[PDB]
Amino acid sequence: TKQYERKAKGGNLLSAFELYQRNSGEWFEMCRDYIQDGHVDESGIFRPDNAFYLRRLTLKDFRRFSLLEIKLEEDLTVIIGNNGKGKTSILYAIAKTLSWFVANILKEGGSGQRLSEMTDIKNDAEDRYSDVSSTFFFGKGLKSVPIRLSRSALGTAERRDSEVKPAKDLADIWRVINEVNTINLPTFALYNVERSQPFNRNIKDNTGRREERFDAYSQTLGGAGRFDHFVEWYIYLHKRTVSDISSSIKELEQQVNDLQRTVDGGMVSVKSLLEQMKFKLSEAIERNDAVLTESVQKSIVEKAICSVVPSISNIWVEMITGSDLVKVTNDGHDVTIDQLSDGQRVFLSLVADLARRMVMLNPLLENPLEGRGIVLIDEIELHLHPKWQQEVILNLRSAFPNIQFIITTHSPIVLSTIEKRCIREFEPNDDGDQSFLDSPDMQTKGSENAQILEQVMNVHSTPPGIAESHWLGNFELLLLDNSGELDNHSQVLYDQIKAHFGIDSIELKKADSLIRINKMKNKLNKIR
Amino acid sequence: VGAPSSPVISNFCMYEFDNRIHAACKKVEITYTRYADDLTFSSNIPDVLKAVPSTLEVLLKDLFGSALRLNHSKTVFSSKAHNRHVTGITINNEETLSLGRDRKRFIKHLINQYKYGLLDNEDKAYLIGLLAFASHIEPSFITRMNEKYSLELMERLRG
Amino acid sequence: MRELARLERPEILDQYIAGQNDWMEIDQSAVWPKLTEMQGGFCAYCECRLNRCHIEHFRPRGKFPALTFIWNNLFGSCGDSRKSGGWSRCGIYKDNGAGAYNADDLIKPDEENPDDYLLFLTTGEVVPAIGLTGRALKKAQETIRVFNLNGDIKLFGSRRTAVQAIMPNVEYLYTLLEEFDEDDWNEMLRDELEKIESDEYKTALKHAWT
RNA sequence: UAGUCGGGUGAUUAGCCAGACUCUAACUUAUUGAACGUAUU
Numbered sequence: 001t002k003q004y005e006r007k008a009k010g011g012n013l014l015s016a017f018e019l020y021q022r023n024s025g026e027w028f029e030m031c032r033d034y035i036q037d038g039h040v041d042e043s044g045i046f047r048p049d050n051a052f053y054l055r056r057l058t059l060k061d062f063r064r065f066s067l068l069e070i071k072l073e074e075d076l077t078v079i080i081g082n083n084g085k086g087k088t089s090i091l092y093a094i095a096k097t098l099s100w101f102v103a104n105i106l107k108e109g110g111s112g113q114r115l116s117e118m119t120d121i122k123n124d125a126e127d128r129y130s131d132v133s134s135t136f137f138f139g140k141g142l143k144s145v146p147i148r149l150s151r152s153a154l155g156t157a158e159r160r161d162s163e164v165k166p167a168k169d170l171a172d173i174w175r176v177i178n179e180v181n182t183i184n185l186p187t188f189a190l191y192n193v194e195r196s197q198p199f200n201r202n203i204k205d206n207t208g209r210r211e212e213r214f215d216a217y218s219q220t221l222g223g224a225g226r227f228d229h230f231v232e233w234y235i236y237l238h239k240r241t242v243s244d245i246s247s248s249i250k251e252l253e254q255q256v257n258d259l260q261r262t263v264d265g266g267m268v269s270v271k272s273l274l275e276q277m278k279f280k281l282s283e284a285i286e287r288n289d290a291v292l293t294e295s296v297q298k299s300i301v302e303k304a305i306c307s308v309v310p311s312i313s314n315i316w317v318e319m320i321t322g323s324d325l326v327k328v329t330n331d332g333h334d335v336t337i338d339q340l341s342d343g344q345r346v347f348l349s350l351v352a353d354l355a356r357r358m359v360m361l362n363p364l365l366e367n368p369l370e371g372r373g374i375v376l377i378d379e380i381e382l383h384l385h386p387k388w389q390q391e392v393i394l395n396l397r398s399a400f401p402n403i404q405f406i407i408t409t410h411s412p413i414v415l416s417t418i419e420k421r422c423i424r425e426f427e428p429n430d431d432g433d434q435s436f437l438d439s440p441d442m443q444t445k446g447s448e449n450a451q452i453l454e455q456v457m458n459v460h461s462t463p464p465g466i467a468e469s470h471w472l473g474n475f476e477l478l479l480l481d482n483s484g485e486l487d488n489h490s491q492v493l494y495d496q497i498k499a500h501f502g503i504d505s506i507e508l509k510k511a512d513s514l515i516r517i518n519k520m521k522n523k524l525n526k527i528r
Numbered sequence: 529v530g531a532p533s534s535p536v537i538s539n540f541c542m543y544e545f546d547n548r549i550h551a552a553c554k555k556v557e558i559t560y561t562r563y564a565d566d567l568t569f570s571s572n573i574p575d576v577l578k579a580v581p582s583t584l585e586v587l588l589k590d591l592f593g594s595a596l597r598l599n600h601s602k603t604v605f606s607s608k609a610h611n612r613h614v615t616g617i618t619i620n621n622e623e624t625l626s627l628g629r630d631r632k633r634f635i636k637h638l639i640n641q642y643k644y645g646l647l648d649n650e651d652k653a654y655l656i657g658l659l660a661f662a663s664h665i666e667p668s669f670i671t672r673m674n675e676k677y678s679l680e681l682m683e684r685l686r687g
Numbered sequence: 688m689r690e691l692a693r694l695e696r697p698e699i700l701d702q703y704i705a706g707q708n709d710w711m712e713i714d715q716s717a718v719w720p721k722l723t724e725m726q727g728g729f730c731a732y733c734e735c736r737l738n739r740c741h742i743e744h745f746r747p748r749g750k751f752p753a754l755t756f757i758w759n760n761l762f763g764s765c766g767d768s769r770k771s772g773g774w775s776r777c778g779i780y781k782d783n784g785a786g787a788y789n790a791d792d793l794i795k796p797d798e799e800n801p802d803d804y805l806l807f808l809t810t811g812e813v814v815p816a817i818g819l820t821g822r823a824l825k826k827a828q829e830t831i832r833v834f835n836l837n838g839d840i841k842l843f844g845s846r847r848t849a850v851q852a853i854m855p856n857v858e859y860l861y862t863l864l865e866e867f868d869e870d871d872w873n874e875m876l877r878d879e880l881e882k883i884e885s886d887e888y889k890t891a892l893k894h895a896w897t
Numbered sequence: 898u899a900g901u902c903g904g905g906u907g908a909u910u911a912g913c914c915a916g917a918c919u920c921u922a923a924c925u926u927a928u929u930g931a932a933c934g935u936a937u938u
């Protein structure tokens with residue numbers, strides 16, 4: 001139509017796509033360029049011209065919320081609050097919405113997930129239905145993609161319909177354009193507290209092929225990730241990389257060169273081994289000479305894991321025992337994955353899974369980890385020592401620069417690494433009627449954790465339920481009651497403070513300071 | 529919506545709604561207008577428009593029960609910090625009605641195409657219609673186009 | 688809290704009368720500059736820096752409609768209901784959070800000196816002053832309870848932090864009493880107390896210095 | 898900083914220039930019907 005032509009020439013993606021579908025060159029290329037075009041910034045990071053992120057979320061009579069509106073950041077949003085404030089509810093709502101994109105990328109007219117009629121409607125909602133309304137952004141050509149998931153309570157006569165067609169329309173563009181000419185695809189993933197499973201290598205899934213590109217969408221919003229799928233995929237990559245003779249020749253050439261240097265250095269004991277390896281190299285060269293994408297994929301993932309996971313310096317596959325084993329160098333020691341602590345394993349699992357999916361979905365990028373997507377992580381600090389909490393968000397954002405992260409945390413240490421604009425905080429005595437969430441008043445990034453406890457988490461830096469926490473206050477009051485002189489009562493308490501906290505304690509130093517100041521104040525008063 | 533009587537009946541059914549909300553808004557210095565299903569509120573006082581959605585829901589429930597409801601997805605706040613439009617008309621930061629920059633640039637594009645005889649008859653007709661609308665919303669734009677493109681060209685086009 | 692010097696009545700309060708008129712009618716930008724003169728951009732009850740703020744009726748408008756457009760009853764409190772809910776000290780808490788209270792047994796800072804009733808310990812707590820009995824104790828204990836001057840963690844934490852930051856400077860000055868003569872030392876203490884007029888939580892900082 | 902508004906230039910829905918704005922905060926929509934503007938008469 002002439003109307004569609006005008007809009008399309010104005011840069012509207014949906015109009016361009018409609019024209020392509022009816023006339024089935026120009027319009028195809030418009031759609032493909034809209035999705036693929038980008039640039040490398042000053043920092044050497046690829047940036048798509050058309051960003052994809054969740055802009056806004058609205059919850060009506062959903063779980064604890066009567067009516068709640070959230071504006072999200074393009075890059076990082078962190079939701080904070082006490083237990084039972086609905087932080088997990090918010091992520092669940094988003095994940096269910098994203099399921100509609102994933103379903104329709106996989107299959108025309110595919111079905112996403114649903115709100116529960118048993119559990120998701122607010123218990124005291126007068127109207128017996130719930131709505132989750134989301135709006136997504138995809139560049140200036142598609143500023144608004146609205147979705148609504150709805151559900152009526154069980155046994156209600158009137159049934160409220162979901163509105164999902166815009167999700168389907170956008171997902172159709174990705175699917176159809178990709179079919180004709182390969183494009184990069186968005187990553188969607190949820191990592192909830194269910195990610196903390198015991199590992200079993202022994203259990204294998206024999207459903208689907210792991211090297212099939214659309215396996216990247218397999219159970220992506222299920223909450224655990226599929227760390228088992230990673231291991232299988234990584235072993236697969238290893239076997240293929242070993243099998244191609246040129247890399248084996250290059251590896252063998254490198255081994256021969258290293259062994260030759262050792263023999264030249266005076267170690268005559270390794271001469272027999274050098275001769276064997278030289279023979280193997282000659283044989284390999286004689287067998288027909290030939291870069292493996294699988295080798296590059298393997299390297300990317302290895303780097304990602306080692307960069308993000310602090311205790312892990314190396315990861316590799318062994319087959320010499322006779323079974324396939326993934327090993328890691330953890331704190332300088334070579335161990336199996338099963339030998340990792342739960343904290344290390346769970347975090348490794350998250351990063352490995354995410355990296356695998358990004359590599360699979362972004363084959364045309366030089367760095368596939370610079371692809372687009374939305375990743376939800378519940379309780380990022382789960383199982384992490386405070387040392388790790390100080391460098392978890394930084395590492396994630398460095399490794400995955402174009403992902404929109406939506407995170408929940410209870411950790412002041414995590415908050416100390418994040419800008420106040422990224423933080424969304426529940427009102428202290430909300431009770432489910434608050435309309436809009438807001439940022440804290442205090443700047444958190446670079447701030448002391450004690451301040452964040454008090455100013456942002458609403459918790460005393462010193463435990464009020466412990467008597468010893470009040471001794472210094474009581475001591476000060478006694479000193480002021482006796483015009484600054486240590487009486488019998490003040491001396492007893494002083495001795496208690498000394499005995500309990502120790503001679504070198506900050507508390508005792510404060511007490512000493514109080515004595516000195518009050519004595520001097522009294523002396524001044526007497527002079528006057 | 530396609531029946532000739534439906535506009536009249538719909539406006540009538542909203543009569544009492546309009547009365548009540550108009551009165552309420554007037555007390556707190558809010559301007560209110562309704563264009564069919566589109567409700568618009570504006571004010572110079574900060575932090576007053578936040579209460580209006582809740583007020584609307586109560587009133588709708590009172591008058592219509594569950595028959596008429598707010599579309600919560602379509603409730604939007606704006607200010608001079610951001611783009612402001614009312615029924616397809618842009619309100620610029622000089623508090624004047626505008627067609628919007630993008631539409632104006634598109635019109636100029638079409639005129640330039642006409643200038644070099646590149647406009648087909650369909651697009652020509654389209655351009656003429658759009659200029660009539662532009663004349664109604666932003667007459668100053670037409671004066672500027674006359675200045676930019678020669679009165680003669682424009683008169684030829686509008687003949 | 689500070690003892691506040693109320694001076695002159697602004698002109699707009701002459702016009703509006705109780706019964707007929709409501710507080711929604713009166714302009715608030717007319718009233719502020721005299722309160723900002725009185726208080727110095729600081730809260731009447733807690734002494735935070737004012738940014739989110741409202742005009743507070745010391746006796747509330749519901750219970751006492753006589754004292755609605757009366758200059759003695761008005762104060763610049765912290766917090767603002769219009770902008771953001773969930774504020775938990777001073778004007779807003781007196782209404783919502785604090786339950787029943789007798790209005791007569793509270794420190795009105797224009798009339799009374801707070802310093803006689805309240806003491807500010809350097810550990811951060813506000814307490815009754817040493818040696819109060821019966822009625823004066825009841826006023827001190829209720830001013831603390833009703834304005835939530837300890838129970839707000841944000842306030843308590845901010846006040847402790849500020850006092851603890853200056854306690855090196857307090858100990859260091861009082862050592863140099865000995866070496867300096869009286870005119871040098873009394874000029875120094877005057878100079879430090881000069882600074883803390885422009886500072887947040889000034890009464891708490893005063894008790895640390897003097 | 899970013900986002901927005903848009904006077905100008907520009908074979909012109911781009912790009913470029915100039916000036917401005919900032920309640921936590923626009924996402925440009927729908928006919929043959931209705932109304933409005935224009936043409937016809």
Ligand SMILES: Nc1ncnc2c1ncn2[C@@H]1O[C@H](COP(=O)(O)OP(=O)(O)O)[C@@H](O)[C@H]1O
Nearest residue numbers: 063064083084085086087088089119121122123
């Ligand atoms: N259908 C419901 N109706 C009312 N309250 C609900 C409903 N479902 C859950 N809740 C309440 O909402 C909270 C859910 O907590 P959750 O979303 O897990 O928050 P968080 O992760 O921050 O602890 C609990 O306080 C629970 O009682």
Ligand SMILES: [Mg+2]
Nearest residue numbers: 928929930931
């Ligand atoms: Mg028509």
Ligand SMILES: [Zn+2]
Nearest residue numbers: 730733765777
């Ligand atoms: Zn206050």
